[PDB]
Amino acid sequence: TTYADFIASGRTGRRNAIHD
Amino acid sequence: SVKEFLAKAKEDFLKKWENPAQNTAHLDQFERIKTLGTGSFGRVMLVKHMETGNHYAMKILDKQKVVKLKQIEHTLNEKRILQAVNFPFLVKLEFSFKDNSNLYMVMEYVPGGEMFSHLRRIGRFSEPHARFYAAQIVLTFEYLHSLDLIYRDLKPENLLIDQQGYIQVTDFGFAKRVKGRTWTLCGTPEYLAPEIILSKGYNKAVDWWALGVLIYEMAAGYPPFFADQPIQIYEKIVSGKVRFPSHFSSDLKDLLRNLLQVDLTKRFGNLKNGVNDIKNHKWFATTDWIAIYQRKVEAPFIPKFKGPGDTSNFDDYEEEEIRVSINEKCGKEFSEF
Ligand SMILES: Cc1cc(C(=O)OCc2cccnc2)n[nH]1
Numbered sequence: 151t152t153y154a155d156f157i158a159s160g161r162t163g164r165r166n167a168i169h170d
Numbered sequence: 171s172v173k174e175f176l177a178k179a180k181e182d183f184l185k186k187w188e189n190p191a192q193n194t195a196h197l198d199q200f201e202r203i204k205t206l207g208t209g210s211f212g213r214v215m216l217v218k219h220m221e222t223g224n225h226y227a228m229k230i231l232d233k234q235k236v237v238k239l240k241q242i243e244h245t246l247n248e249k250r251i252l253q254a255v256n257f258p259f260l261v262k263l264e265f266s267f268k269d270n271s272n273l274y275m276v277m278e279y280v281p282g283g284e285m286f287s288h289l290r291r292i293g294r295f296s297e298p299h300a301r302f303y304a305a306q307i308v309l310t311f312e313y314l315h316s317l318d319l320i321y322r323d324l325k326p327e328n329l330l331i332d333q334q335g336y337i338q339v340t341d342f343g344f345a346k347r348v349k350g351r352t353w354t355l356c357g358t359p360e361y362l363a364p365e366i367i368l369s370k371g372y373n374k375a376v377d378w379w380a381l382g383v384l385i386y387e388m389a390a391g392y393p394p395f396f397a398d399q400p401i402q403i404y405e406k407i408v409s410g411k412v413r414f415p416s417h418f419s420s421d422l423k424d425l426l427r428n429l430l431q432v433d434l435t436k437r438f439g440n441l442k443n444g445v446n447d448i449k450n451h452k453w454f455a456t457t458d459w460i461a462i463y464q465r466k467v468e469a470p471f472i473p474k475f476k477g478p479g480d481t482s483n484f485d486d487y488e489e490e491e492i493r494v495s496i497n498e499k500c501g502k503e504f505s506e507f
Pocket residue numbers: 206207214227229261277278279280281327328330340341342
């Protein structure tokens with residue numbers, strides 16, 4: 151499922167901003 | 171009238187924008203309690219203002235770290251904008267000052283915690299719950315955009331829940347007053363509009379694309395474009411193929427297809443009717459916009475609040491002592507702060 155894929159991803163924590 | 175309310179809001183903003191408040195407090199007037207969050211160039215701490223007993227959220231930025239990250243202009247924009255704005259859904263800047271080492275922005279303390287925390291724990295929000303929050307962002311962007319401000323960092327991490335269960339927008343680090351198009355590559359990977367990724371000049375329509383990402387994330391429990399590496403997230407965004415969970419209503423999917431529109435001549439919020447194309451959409455049919463603005467709508471969730479200065483709605487962070495150098499650092503760079 152997409153939820154299981156999300157939960158298993160490295161991007162469930164606070165996401166840092168990008169710049170430059 | 172909306173046009174008339176915004177006209178007066180612009181007058182109020184412009185006076186503060188052209189003559190910014192500076193040096194309104196000192197570090198020594200506050201008792202430092204706990205860190206509420208951290209970032210690349212500083213931290214946010216719960217503090218108590220001794221003279222009043224009021225609690226606040228103090229953002230501390232290390233000037234040397236700001237300089238290294240080339241965020242000088244972005245930090246001057248943040249403080250100059252924050253001291254000039256006034257809206258029910260924006261976290262209020264109470265005081266600002268600087269010392270030899272750091273810049274300080276003392277904000278109103280929002281005790282309910284980040285929407286990020288609640289969304290991740292709960293999993294996802296119901297369409298009426300997501301709608302209640304989305305309406306607040308619609309009105310906030312309508313206000314900001316009318317002042318020629320682009321926000322550029324919409325995400326659950328930057329949205330705080332107050333005691334009444336309403337949103338408070340924080341983090342104006344990428345906010346900019348701009349009349350034309352802009353080019354800076356900034357934001358959060360999952361929330362970037364394709365124009366930003368493709369190094370095109372862009373405008374306020376990027377905030378409307380980010381609203382589409384937020385509404386999707388709130389209602390689904392995960393964002394429309396995710397992957398382990400930002401490059402892979404960018405590939406998904408530029409294709410713009412979005413799949414919706416089976417539980418998303420027909421109205422929701424249609425609103426998201428118009429917000430998450432790769433074509434700028436077709437993106438809602440960016441058309442001749444502007445924000446009205448969003449406010450009048452079928453998914454918002456039950457939303458009483460005036461009542462949302464006036465905070466008379468009952469919130470779907472009220473945070474638990476044990477008492478003043480309680481931090482249980484915030485994660486724990488490692489504490490670091492605030493060191494103030496005996497020598498002034500980066501004085502010239504931050505002269506206007
Ligand atoms: C992520 C972030 C938060 C801020 C901030 O200034 O927030 C103020 C705040 C934080 C916690 C509780 N109340 C207000 N800036 N960037």
